[PDB]
Structure formats: C-alpha cells, structure tokens
Design an enzyme around this catalytic site. Structure first.
Site, short mmCIF file in Angstrom:
data_model
loop_
_atom_site.label_atom_id
_atom_site.label_comp_id
_atom_site.label_asym_id
_atom_site.label_seq_id
_atom_site.Cartn_x
_atom_site.Cartn_y
_atom_site.Cartn_z
N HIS A 1 -10.18 2.88 -6.40
CA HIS A 1 -10.27 3.88 -5.33
C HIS A 1 -11.55 4.68 -5.52
O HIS A 1 -11.76 5.22 -6.64
CB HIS A 1 -9.02 4.77 -5.31
CG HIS A 1 -8.76 5.46 -4.01
ND1 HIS A 1 -9.58 6.49 -3.53
CD2 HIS A 1 -7.79 5.28 -3.08
CE1 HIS A 1 -9.08 6.92 -2.38
NE2 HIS A 1 -8.00 6.19 -2.07
N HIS B 1 2.11 4.93 -1.63
CA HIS B 1 1.92 6.10 -2.52
C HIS B 1 3.29 6.70 -2.84
O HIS B 1 4.04 7.10 -1.93
CB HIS B 1 0.98 7.12 -1.88
CG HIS B 1 -0.40 6.65 -1.61
ND1 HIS B 1 -1.50 7.14 -2.30
CD2 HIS B 1 -0.88 5.78 -0.69
CE1 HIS B 1 -2.59 6.58 -1.81
NE2 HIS B 1 -2.23 5.73 -0.83
N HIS C 1 -9.35 15.36 4.38
CA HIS C 1 -10.60 15.56 3.59
C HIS C 1 -11.01 17.03 3.54
O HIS C 1 -12.07 17.27 2.97
CB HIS C 1 -11.78 14.74 4.15
CG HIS C 1 -12.24 13.63 3.26
ND1 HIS C 1 -11.47 12.53 3.00
CD2 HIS C 1 -13.41 13.43 2.62
CE1 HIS C 1 -12.14 11.70 2.22
NE2 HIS C 1 -13.33 12.23 1.96
N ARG D 1 -16.95 7.03 10.02
CA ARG D 1 -15.69 6.46 9.42
C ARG D 1 -14.60 6.14 10.48
O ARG D 1 -13.94 5.08 10.31
CB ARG D 1 -15.13 7.38 8.33
CG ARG D 1 -13.78 6.94 7.74
CD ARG D 1 -13.40 7.60 6.41
NE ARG D 1 -12.02 7.38 6.03
CZ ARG D 1 -11.44 7.76 4.88
NH1 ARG D 1 -12.13 8.40 3.93
NH2 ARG D 1 -10.15 7.50 4.71
N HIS E 1 -6.76 -1.46 3.78
CA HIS E 1 -7.22 -0.84 5.06
C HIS E 1 -8.63 -1.33 5.41
O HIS E 1 -9.62 -0.53 5.37
CB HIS E 1 -7.08 0.68 4.99
CG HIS E 1 -7.57 1.32 3.74
ND1 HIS E 1 -8.88 1.24 3.33
CD2 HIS E 1 -6.91 2.11 2.85
CE1 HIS E 1 -9.03 1.96 2.22
NE2 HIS E 1 -7.81 2.49 1.89
N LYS F 1 -5.54 -0.55 -8.89
CA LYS F 1 -6.15 -0.04 -7.68
C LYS F 1 -7.50 0.56 -8.04
O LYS F 1 -7.53 1.49 -8.85
CB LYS F 1 -5.29 1.09 -7.08
CG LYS F 1 -5.94 1.84 -5.91
CD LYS F 1 -6.08 1.02 -4.64
CE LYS F 1 -6.49 1.84 -3.44
NZ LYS F 1 -5.46 2.79 -3.02
N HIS G 1 -10.10 0.12 -2.44
CA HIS G 1 -10.63 1.13 -1.49
C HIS G 1 -12.06 1.39 -1.97
O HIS G 1 -12.24 1.98 -3.04
CB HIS G 1 -9.71 2.37 -1.47
CG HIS G 1 -10.21 3.54 -0.68
ND1 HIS G 1 -9.36 4.30 0.10
CD2 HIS G 1 -11.44 4.11 -0.59
CE1 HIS G 1 -10.05 5.28 0.64
NE2 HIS G 1 -11.33 5.19 0.23
N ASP H 1 -12.10 7.61 -4.91
CA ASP H 1 -11.84 8.98 -5.40
C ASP H 1 -11.93 9.04 -6.94
O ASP H 1 -12.11 10.16 -7.47
CB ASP H 1 -10.49 9.50 -4.91
CG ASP H 1 -10.44 9.99 -3.47
OD1 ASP H 1 -11.29 9.56 -2.65
OD2 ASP H 1 -9.51 10.77 -3.15
N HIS I 1 0.85 -1.22 0.00
CA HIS I 1 0.00 0.00 0.00
C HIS I 1 0.87 1.25 0.00
O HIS I 1 0.76 2.07 0.95
CB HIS I 1 -1.01 0.00 1.16
CG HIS I 1 -2.10 0.98 0.96
ND1 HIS I 1 -3.40 0.69 1.27
CD2 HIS I 1 -2.09 2.23 0.45
CE1 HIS I 1 -4.16 1.74 0.97
NE2 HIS I 1 -3.36 2.72 0.47
N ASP J 1 0.34 2.59 3.74
CA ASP J 1 -0.47 3.72 3.20
C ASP J 1 0.44 4.96 3.14
O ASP J 1 -0.05 6.09 3.33
CB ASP J 1 -1.79 3.88 3.97
CG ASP J 1 -2.96 4.40 3.12
OD1 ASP J 1 -2.68 5.11 2.13
OD2 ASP J 1 -4.15 4.12 3.47
AG AG Z 1 -9.33 12.17 3.19
AG AG Z 2 -7.12 10.09 4.31
NI NI Z 3 -7.40 4.03 0.61
NI NI Z 4 -3.83 4.72 0.21
O O Z 5 -5.58 4.71 1.51
#
Ligand code: AG
Ligand code: AG
Ligand code: NI
Ligand code: NI
Ligand code: O
Ligand code: AG
Ligand code: AG
Ligand code: NI
Ligand code: NI
Ligand code: O
Lengths: 570, 100, 122, 570, 100, 100
Positions: free
Chosen positions: D222, D139, D323, D339, D275, D220, D249, D224, D137, D363
């Site tokens: 996600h 980035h 966020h 969450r 996660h 992945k 995710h 988003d 995981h 992460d």
């Molecule tokens: Ag966020």
């Molecule tokens: Ag976050």
């Molecule tokens: Ni994630």
């Molecule tokens: Ni992530």
């Molecule tokens: O994540």
C-alpha cells in the site's frame, strides 16, 4: 521554515504552551512539554512520513526495537503530567513514551520506538489520551453494564456480584468459593479487566480466608451482612496475611458502634472507605470523618457528584425506593433525613477539590451510574473552579494542577488502593496498554476508542455497510479486541497471590491474563497521588456542618452542569 | 421485509430525527445528537425521494441554523455523512459545516 | 465567552521545523507527462527517474516542508524547492535501492542513479 | 402422463430450456441441462418422496454412501455451468452433484448421493444456488461488517486490520507477528472464512517473511506504507518463496516511479492489482493499464461499480473526506481531479464486460461497501447488456455467457488469485460446502440462506416467537452454524504453508478448520475463468481516454439501477 | 414494561410502517419492504383493536393497491404473515396476495 | 451522534410511547406496558424540557387515570422509575402510584 501555532496544532495536535478546553467546561489543560523534534513528527497516510525507508524502518525484525503499535502525537493527561508524546506498545504493554519513527533519518527517536514492518499506527494528533478508568465500586448485576462503562472510558471493574440477586444488588460481594469460581468463569466473557471481592463477614478466619484462596482479589464489609467489630477485625486480619484490600460500607444505623468504634476495630490497618460522604452508606451522620485518617483510602460514589439543585430531591426518593422506606413510618423518615444531607454532599465537593477524598467510583446498579465516574469527576472539578477559583498551586492561567488531582481519582489512586498499579492506572512505561482516546469536544463524555492490552476493544464508529466508517449512525460498538479468543489476551482477571500459587486459573480453565494483587497493606492516604491530605474532619452531630481547620465547608448546589444536555439524546 | 443489518440500524436514525423534530416543535434549542439525527434523516429521505447527491450537499446546509441549536453545537459538527439508496444505488452524501 | 467545546487556545509564536540543519535550494523539472507529488521524508536523490535536477544535491537530504506534506510537479513543470539535511544515523535503505547504507557514499549512489537512468547525474 | 412446463417449474424449479429473470434486471439465465429422472425428482414433506422405503433408503449406515445433507432441485449458477441438480454434502464438503434419493426404487441415482437416516434436506426447488462470495479486499475495521457481508452472500473475507486503527482504516494490513497472532485469535469468533494479509513493506526480507511464518495468508503493498520499488521487490521475493499472493495499491503520486517503474519492480512476477481502475488508488492516471498484462490478476473495488449519474459527485467528495483534502489547496484539487476520472470509471464497466478485469471485491469500510460486491456485479452486467447488447458468444436469447463471466468475478477468480480455489470459490465436487440460496426475486440483493461448511450460518427468517418462521419481521439473523463450538467446524482460517508446518494453529489454540494457501505463483491472467483477456490498454495522459485495439472505450452513466429502490428500506 | 424478545422486535415493524406511511404521504410509490411493513403493522394494530382473524384476512387485501407501490411489488408479495395478541391470545393472520 | 448504550435503549421507550398514544387516540383502554411507556417517555421528555425532579414527581401522577387503562392496570403499577439528563446531569425520577 516556520508554521504558525494554529496550523501546527491543527496538523499535529497542540505543543508546549498551547491550551485545550475540556469538553464544554471552563477547564483548560496546558501542554507542559513535547518529546517531538519539530519537522520529524510521525504521521501515517498517503504521502506521509511513516513509509518504508522514511519514518518507517525497513531493516529491523519485530524483536530489534520495533513497536507493535504507535499512537502518534498524543496529548497525555495523567497524574505524571500533561504533555505531548508518541506512545509505543509491544506485547500489549506500553514500552516507550517519547518519539517514534526511524533512526535511519530522524533526530530524537527513542531507541525502542522504531516504526517497522510489524507496527500498526493509531493517529492521536488532536486527541487527549488518558489511562483507562479504574472503577473499584462495581456491582455485577447486569452484563449490559460493561458497554456502559467502556463508553465513558472505564477499563477495569473491581467489585462483586452473581447477577440480579438481592445480596449482589445491595453489596459488592461474590460470596464463598463456588460463587467466586462461577463468576471467574463468567469473567472469561467480559471485555473489561475484572477483580472480584468476597464477603468480608465472619467471626472465624477460615470462612473468609477460603474466599481469597478460591480467587477473590479483595473483600467487602457491608452493613447488610453485619458491619460489626468482629466482621471488620477478621476481614482485616485476612487481608494483612493475603495482601489484598478491604472495602468498607460501615454501620449507618450505629447498631454495634459509632464511627469511633469502627475505627477502633480497624486499629490503624489500611482500608478503602467506599462512598465516604455517606449517602451511599455509613455511620449517620459522620462517616465522612474517615477521609481525614492516614490509614483510610477514601472514595466517593458518583450520584452525589457534584452537588446540584435536583441532588437532594433525587436522593431522598432513591433511598426510599432502594430501602422500601414508608413515608408513614417516622423511623423511616428520621433514617432518610439522618442519611441524605446537603451539608455533607456540599462539603464532599470541597474535600475533592482539597485532595482530602482521593478516589471516584460508580456504585454501578446498586446506588450509582456505571457510565458516569469520569463524567462526574470533570463536572466536579469545573463546579469547584467556578465557586472556589483557580487553586493557588496553578500557573499560566491553566487548570493543569486541578486536572492532575482529578484525573488521579479514577486512574492511579484506585489502582494503588486495590494493589494493581503495577499493571494499570496510568500511562507509564511497563504498564498494560489500557488507553482511552478522546476528541477534546467529547472529553470525559464519550470515549472515541478504548484500547485494551494494545487492541481496540470499543469505538464510536458508524455504518458498518458504508464506504468509510464515519457515516451515520455513529454509536459505541465492541471491536475485534472483544471477539473470539482475543478477549482472553486483551483483558486481566486480578487474583490473590494464594489463588495464583494454588493454581486456580488452571483448575478453572481461565485463559485471561492473570494479574497479581499486591502491596495493599503497606500504603495509606500519603500514597494517594495529588490527593494525600490528612486532617481532623469535624461533623456537627446536631447541624451536620463539616469543619476542616475549624472552618465550615459549604457550597451552593448548581442549576446547570457542562457535559450534560449538549451531548445526551436522553 | 428482508431487513439487512444497515436497514435495521438506519431505522434508529429516522426515530431519533422524529424525537428531535418533536423537541424543536415545542421550542427547545436542539443539542449535538438531535441536530446530527435531523440532518442525517433529511439526507436519507432525500435519497429515497430521488434527489441527487449534489442537491443534498446544498440542501443539507439549510436544514438547521445556529438559532435552532444550543451554543457550541454548530462548531461541534464539522460534517454529517450518510449512505442511502438513490435510484442509481447506494451513494455517500457528506454535508460540510451543515450549521452556521 | 462563547464556548466551542474542545477548542484550542494556542500560545503566541511560530514553530521552526528542521531547526539548525543546512538548507539548500535546487530547481527540479517533471520531464514526464504525468504528475509527481513528493513527500517530506523521501531521500530526495531517490525520487522518480523523470524528475530532472542535480541528483548529487538530493543526497543525504529531503524536502524542508512540514512533516507529512508534499511538493507537487504537474507534467512539464519546473520549480525551485528547498531541501534540509537527513538526521539520525544519516542512512537510507530501500526506497529506490540507490543508497542501502550511509548517505556519505555519494560516488556509489550517483553510479547506481546514472546506470538506472535517474535524470540529472552530472 | 405429462406435466406442462409452468406446473413443472412451479413444483420442482425450472428445467432444460426454461429461463429465469435475475431479480429486477433485464438478465435471463437458461437451464443448460438437468441431472434428474423425470418422475423420480427428490422432495421432502408430508406424503412426499424422501420417506423410509421410498426416496429415502432405510438400509445404509452413514458410511455406506449416505449424505449428511441434500439440497433438492437446485438451479446452480457457477463458472462451471447453469444447470439443474441435487447437491449432496458430507463432512462439510460437496461430495456429489447429480441425482439424490434411493437406488432401491429410483432410476439415475448418483451412487454416493443416497438419502438415508443420516440425511438432512434443504428444498432448493425454485431457488438459485451459487458458491459463497470471495471478497479479497477486506479491511477488518468493525466486527459488525461480517453480517453485512453474509446478508449479500459473501462467505470468505481476505484482507487485513486490527479494528479502527488508522493503518487498518487505510490498508488491508495486519502488521507483524503479534498483530497477526491477536487477529488469528479474534478470527475464532467471526462466522465467516478469513485469510490475513501482512504488511508488504521493507528493504530486508526477514521483517516481511516473519509475518508469513506467524500465520499471514498473503501480503499487501500500500502506498500509505511506501509502495516503493524496494517494498514491491522484497514482498514478491517473499511471496515466491512462501507460495502466497501479493495485493498492490500502487504509488498514486508517482513519487518514486510511474506505472512502468512499478511493472519493472514486479519484473513479470504474479500480483493481484487491487481497485485497478484507480479511484480506490494507484499511479495517476494510468494504473488501469495493469489489467492488460498476463502476470496481473486485476480486481475492481465496488463503489465505481457501475458508472452512474451520482458516481463522480459522490467520489470527488468521498476522496476529500477520506484524504482530509482542502478545496483551498490547489495541490489537493489537482490530486483529486488526477484520481477521480469519468473516462476510467466509464472504461471500467466495458473492461468488466470484455473479461479484461477478472475480479470484484468490496474495499469494505476503507473505500467500499462490505455488502455490495455481489449486488454491484449484477448491476454492471445489466447496465452492459442495456448499452452493449447481448455479447456475440450468447445463444437462445439467454445471458448465460455474461452470467458465467460475471459470477466468476466474485467466486472462482478471487479464490484462484489467493491460492484457496482447492477449498472454496465454486460449486464443484470436493470443495467446502459454502453455498448461498437465493429467491430469483432477491437474487444478488438479499441471500435467503447462507451455508458454511454444510450448516446454515445466516438466514432471512422471521418472528422467533411464531408458530412458523415466515411471520414478520423477516430479517437477516445468525443461525446455529455461528453458535458455540460449531463456529469452529463451519469456517476456515486460511494460512501460509510455513505457519501450518511451524504449528501456529496449536501454538495459538485455533480450533477453526485450517486451510492451506498454495499455487499462487504459477498462475496469471489466463487462469481467470471467463475473464482471461490480455491486451495493450492505452490511457491518454492528457485526456484520460482509454483505448483497447486503438478503439476508445466510453459509455454513459445511468440515472437508475435495478436491485436498488425496489428492495431497500434506506 | 417487561418487554419480551418479540415485543422488542415488533416495535421495529410499527416504526418501519410509520416511515413508509410518511413516504406515501409525500407521494412516493412504495417499495417491497415499505409495503410489507404497512400491511404488517395494520394486522398487529387490528389485533390490538380486537378485530377477528377473519376480518384482518379480508381488510389486509385493501390496505394498498398496485397504484400505491412500484412496478413488480404486487407480484413480489405472495402473502404477509403476522402474529399478534388478540383478546383470545396470540393468533396467526396470513393475508394472501395483499396487493392487486 | 455518538449514541451510548442507554441512548440506544431509551429510543425504544419513546417509540413504545408513540405507539401507545396512537392506540389511546383511537379510543383503546391502554394495557400495562402501554401505560408504563407513556408515563416513562413523559418523564424523560420533561427532563429534556428542563423541569425539576420535584415537578415530574407531581405531574407523573396525572398523565393517565384509571379510565384511560384496562381493569387492574392501576394496581399493577406500584411506581415508574426513569433516569434522564436534566440541565444538572443524569437524575432518577420515581413516580409513586402514577395511576389512580
Ligand atoms: Ag484517502
Ligand atoms: Ag480512500
Ligand atoms: Ni487501496
Ligand atoms: Ni483498501
Ligand atoms: O483501497
Ligand atoms: Ag437502600
Ligand atoms: Ag441504596
Ligand atoms: Ni455501599
Ligand atoms: Ni455499593
Ligand atoms: O454502595
């Protein structure tokens, strides 16, 4: 449904008529127009618009009008305008300025700016986006100079040097075929665009010309090598054949000629006048008269920029250190007083404001500051607003006219002068994606992210061990654009046509993108964007007073600048 | 010592904080990086002392006031974030609008 | 003239979003026991099965809310939302695989919605 | 002649029945067996055994069963066992685990573990040796993250990113053929193993699949980018054809479906649940129910690991920052409370202990700590020993059963899930020689030496100007494995079969070892070493209470952890 | 200044020692890296003062005691080594079992 | 903080100056790098205080005297140069023959 303009600007960055303060200056830029469709703004994140089936297209392969990268909601500050747009990048170039997203469901989408499976997103809402700075007066003395430049938004270094050799410590010169070859191979490791200048000195053509054929992008005539009528004439003869630019640092000592003897040797050919005010070098005391001629592309170096209370005391001593001057040799004292002049440094601020000096540059590590070309450009515009008022051309209480004139000095104008504006120097479709994001609060002081050929090369970012990247310490750091082979694809070595035709990149194993120098010999002052003024500049040989239209140009040195003690730890 | 990359970097914050505190002691209004360094080092030294995240979120808003710093600096600092080793391991502290 | 570095001086007035597009108010109910938050640009007819509303009235439409914001439905919550019209080619692909083409094919969208148990196909 | 067991363990490291404390935890590992012949132990130095004619063979050429490298007297901690052996390396791979030396004069010498003229020696007596950590995981946000990972014993980074672009700052995604190509060329410069994930989003196959063909090792999905039924279904269709893994995710907001709608889209296909507890992202509040299904390979990210007094206060605020949540928008407050849940974070410790969550991950720089996957794995095992007692399966008062279950979470299990366990993830004959030496006192906190493909890449070592290397300051430093071309031979770029068959390494000039991703589609939960439990996980939608076998899983947050303030300068 | 690599690195030890001494002054039991930094800087400052290697081998065992440091730290530090410029050039000091 | 390369480097000078001042306070004659660090940090802290270039050119010659430093050090230092942010931006200060 309506959004008031405070919430709109907080969410998406400002729109038509909104103004933004540049750092802590008195300068305001106004959004002139906006390419968006209100309600179809692009944005990226949890529950946001760039998602599959929505603002992100789920159908099209990369080739089918899909972007590699979208900068959402950028406030662009460029010679072309001050306006709001999404910026689309593909194959390391800017392909679209307009409105990104998904024509499935969105109105107003620029046809070649589809967000697709292949698209990365950079959120530019609330950022100012400019072209990368083009510094055309660079001495290659110390590799640590490159990060200094990246941190203040410079993406292209043009100049010369082999490291801290005296010839390189005085002059923007990589001399002869071997040094030029060694520095082309060094350049493979420098995460910034580069162009190398050869020695513009000789009385035969071949010793000069062989530098262009070896890979030089241009020449520098410097008094330290002999800025004689012969070296000037041969260099310009070579440059007219090879289609490269010549920079000049003229004969300060008037040994072989006065300014009029240098102009006669130039004989109406195109030339880049370096540090045209003359503290940095040139015909004592009247070199700055170069900036009125239509064949002269005139640049300032940055330590005179702008005129402050400490400027003169700093410069008299800088020159003494730099030249090993002795305060007990009257010739050394007469020389210094003939060269460091408040009358010309004061006039230099106003010439910048009038568009008579077209360009800024650093003089990095020779007589100038690698990280302060952008910084000192905005300090000058702000000082001139305070002393001279809004320029007549302004409207709406904005400084857009002054902002375009000043951003041109370190973006498009040095690109045009060097013959590289087809690749770099502005945010226009078809140019290399050298882009700088700024927080307005840091504008001109510290770049947020520097993009080189469509990948971030440099970023202010924090703790690498942290859950998120914003915890302290936030500092300037090299990013993945600079690592491994990606340093080759994100950066341009600019070279002469002849060295390109003669296969010098393959001969030397250069893996960097090769840029072609061209269209340098067919331009003058009138091609300087927003800075195109030709006039008769008179410099009184007794008083050093500067006149334009028989009017004395003078202003006061200031005690304080913006973009200084609020920002800097040292 | 076995210093890891973050231990090496975070030493710099403590040093910048010491420099900034010296400058405040001779009566200077502090600038943007000085102010950020002071509050940052405060948080990391708080974590070393065994304070909780909730304590440092409160205390961090009272380390500097607008009369300690130059014009505009309160408004340039939206928040200050730092990660430090608490007795229960690494945690993130964010101090929101630390200076009014 | 206190200086806030980088501050905005926004012009007077308001920004109208989705100007000139038909607006539609519908009642929507989260029949589920877990919260549902719906974004500005999801084809309204393709949202979570357990949201009960007149599914036909979601076709060719999305929430009339600022770009990148959402409507939230707590477990058991019923409330009204305003919809606006999709623009562009008025086509939708993927998401819940109910459209994959022009939003004009209402019969086919509702047939797929009904078969997969998207609540409120009338 | 006999040696008492205190002197034996001090000279050669511990032997059968001896126990060792892991750092400053309450966890004890017991030597299960020992490959040595007591009296013929290998060791290197003045007057020691590995000398010509003695424990070093003076006859055999490198090809004749002689090692490139012997680690003497290693205490191995691996899913395969906790035991004492010499480890032999050749051509950058582990060829022998057993007994090294010279069959001329020694009993018990593994035939392919001859110390010869060609053999380097690393003294592992008194060290714990593990496989390199496999972080799946990651980035790619800031290149400074790599040393952070090396310093805590991570040798493989799987994830995505182009640097600090918002898409990369939220999601483990290198989107589209161009970004994947640019980051493959960046990877040439990163002294760690790498595999790149493409964007698992689209409603047509081609835009996704072209990412696998360009060089992605996986995908992945996600939220988003739209974690919609379509993006899930197409990504898994692509992954079943290409033989790569998909990470998910899920849709935290339940916008297009609840958890059961996501599982229906997965339709029994193999998927890596990132996660899985859900603070890091997923179907509110019940995402963690994924970890009971046999087609789900479930991983935790590290900031929830383990549950401490500061965890909740830290996470509510981390999420608000991450966020851009506003405490004056009730929807933002409901979202955060839906969450960040003590009930699920508390249950997550016990699921780890029961072998229901199979994997750890960082992460890194998105919502997790690049250097703390190994650290927080052992902090969790220690907390669970304190609260739950020795597991029933234990014997001899050791924690060997728990130690194998927990070391599996960051070594073999992420390797199996990613399709790369043929190359990395354990200390077994035939796998790449990615090895971490630890002083027991620093175990899980700071790696002594990190070996990449049989050469040390990273070491805690001191003053480079000193007579010996142990004087201060001792810090983590890159070693000769990372310099020049040796960075190519010591590290693996993991790629899809199709990109390998299509010649992408030669197209891009990659010089790194190329690893093949395979056998990802034919595995499930039961292939997770020591962590193979499938069960019906119930998450109460009103209370968020977690039940397994109709029993509420809860534990207390702790005030203090080991492997923290004793070790860390900050 | 003409700083060489080692001069640059060893500045870090002095800084870590200053940070650690501050932490001891506010009553914290010192951890592994803090303790190592304090004794290390002590040795290098001793060499600058012109003390002999034999003096610093003796003194180094009395800079910190087990009551200055956390549980287990005395036993984690087997020895502390440092090279510094004495009046007779660079020499190596090793302090064996500095903390009981 | 947004530290640029020069801010990062110049932190080192302040640290070396603090180390050197400590050494002078315990009665040591200062060496070449110590002396250069002290006068350098003096200039940069002067610029932060808002002094002029001309003031620091004068003051810099009186920070240390030959009785503060070892034999030969006055003669090894021809000048000391530093750039710092004055209220009117970055400027160069050179102190000529700082120690007699
Ligand atoms: Ag966020
Ligand atoms: Ag976050
Ligand atoms: Ni994630
Ligand atoms: Ni992530
Ligand atoms: O994540
Ligand atoms: Ag000079
Ligand atoms: Ag000069
Ligand atoms: Ni010059
Ligand atoms: Ni120059
Ligand atoms: O110059």
């Amino acid at each position: 449904m309506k959004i008031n303009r405070q919430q709109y600007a907080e969410s998406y960055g400002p729109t038509v008529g909104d103004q933004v303060r540049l750092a802590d200056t008195d300068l305001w830029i106004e959004v002139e127009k906006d390419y968006t469709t209100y309600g179809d703004e692009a944005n990226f994140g949890g529950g946001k618009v760039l998602r599959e089936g929505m603002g992100e297209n789920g159908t099209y392969t990369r080739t089918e009008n899909v972007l590699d990268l979208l900068l959402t909601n950028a406030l662009i500050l460029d010679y072309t305008g001050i306006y709001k747009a999404d910026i689309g990048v593909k194959d390391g170039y800017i392909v679209g300025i307009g409105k990104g997203g998904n024509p499935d469901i969105m109105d107003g989408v620029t046809p070649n700016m589809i967000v697709g499976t292949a698209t990365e997103v950079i959120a530019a809402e609330g950022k100012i986006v400019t072209a990368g700075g083009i510094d055309t007066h660079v001495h290659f003395i110390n590799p640590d100079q490159v990060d200094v430049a990246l941190a203040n938004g410079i993406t292209t270094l043009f100049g010369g040097g082999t490291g801290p050799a005296e010839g390189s410590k005085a002059t923007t010169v990589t001399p002869g075929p071997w040094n030029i070859e060694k520095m082309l191979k060094s350049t493979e490791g420098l995460p910034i665009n580069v162009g190398i200048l050869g020695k513009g000195h000789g009385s035969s053509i071949a010793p000069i010309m062989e530098q262009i054929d070896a890979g030089a992008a241009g020449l520098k005539i410097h008094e330290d090598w002999g800025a004689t009528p012969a070296s000037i004439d041969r260099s310009l003869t070579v440059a007219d054949e090879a289609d490269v630019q010549v920079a000049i640092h003229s004969d300060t000592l008037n040994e072989a000629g006065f300014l009029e003897d240098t102009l006669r040797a130039i004989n109406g050919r195109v030339i880049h006048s370096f540090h045209v005010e003359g503290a940095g070098g040139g015909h004592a005391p009247d070199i700055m008269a170069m900036a009125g001629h239509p064949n002269v592309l005139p640049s300032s170096t940055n330590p005179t920029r702008p005129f402050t209370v400490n400027t003169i005391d700093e410069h008299l001593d800088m020159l003494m250190v730099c030249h090993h001057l002795k305060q007990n040799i009257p010739e050394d004292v007469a020389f210094a007083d003939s060269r460091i002049r408040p009358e010309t440094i004061a006039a230099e601020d106003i010439l910048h404001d009038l568009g008579i000096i077209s360009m800024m540059s650093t003089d990095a590590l020779a007589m100038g500051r690698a990280g302060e070309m952008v910084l000192r450009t905005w300090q000058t515009a702000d000082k001139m607003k305070k002393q001279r008022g809004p320029l007549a051309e302004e409207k709406n209480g904005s400084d857009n006219f002054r902002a375009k004139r000043y951003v041109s000095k370190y973006t498009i104008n040095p690109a045009i002068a060097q013959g590289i504006a087809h690749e770099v120097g502005s945010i226009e479709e078809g140019k290399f994606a050298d882009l700088v994001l700024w927080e307005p609060k840091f504008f001109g002081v510290k770049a947020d992210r520097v993009i080189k050929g469509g990948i971030i090369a440099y970023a202010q970012i924090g703790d690498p061990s942290a859950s998120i990247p914003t915890p302290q310490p936030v500092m300037g750091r090299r990013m993945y654009g600079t690592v491994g082979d990606l340093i080759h694809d994100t950066n341009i070595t600019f070279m002469s046509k002849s060295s390109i035709q003669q296969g010098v990149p393959a001969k030397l194993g250069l893996k960097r993108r090769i840029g072609t120098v061209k269209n340098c010999r067919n331009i003058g002052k009138k091609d300087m964007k927003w800075n195109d003024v030709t006039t008769d500049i008179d410099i009184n040989p007794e008083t050093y007073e500067v006149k334009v239209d028989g009017e004395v140009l003078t202003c006061e040195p200031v005690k304080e600048l913006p973009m200084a003690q609020r920002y800097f730890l040292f | 010592m076995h210093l890891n990359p973050a231990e090496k970097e975070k030493l710099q914050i403590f040093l910048a904080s010491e420099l900034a505190l010296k400058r405040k002691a001779r009566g200077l209004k502090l600038n943007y990086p000085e102010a950020v360094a002071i509050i940052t080092s405060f948080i990391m030294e708080g974590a070393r002392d065994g304070k909780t995240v909730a304590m440092l979120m409160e205390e961090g808003k009272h380390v500097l006031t607008r009369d300690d710093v130059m014009e505009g600096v309160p408004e340039m600092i939206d928040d200050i974030q730092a990660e430090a080793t608490f007795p229960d391991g690494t945690k993130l502290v964010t101090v929101h609008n630390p200076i009014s | 003239n206190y200086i806030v570095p980088g501050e905005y001086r926004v012009a007077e007035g308001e920004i109208e979003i989705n100007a000139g597009r038909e607006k539609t108010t519908i009642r929507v109910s989260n029949t589920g026991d877990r919260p549902i938050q719906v974004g500005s640009h999801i084809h309204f007819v393709e949202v979570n099965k357990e949201l009960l509303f007149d599914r036909a009235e979601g076709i060719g439409r999305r929430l009339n809310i600022p770009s990148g914001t959402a409507a939230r439905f707590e477990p058991g919550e019923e409330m009204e939302v305003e919809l606006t019209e999709l623009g562009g080619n008025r086509e939708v692909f993927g998401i819940s695989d109910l459209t994959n083409g022009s939003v004009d094919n209402k019969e086919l969208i509702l047939q797929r919605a009904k078969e997969l148990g998207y609540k409120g196909v009338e």
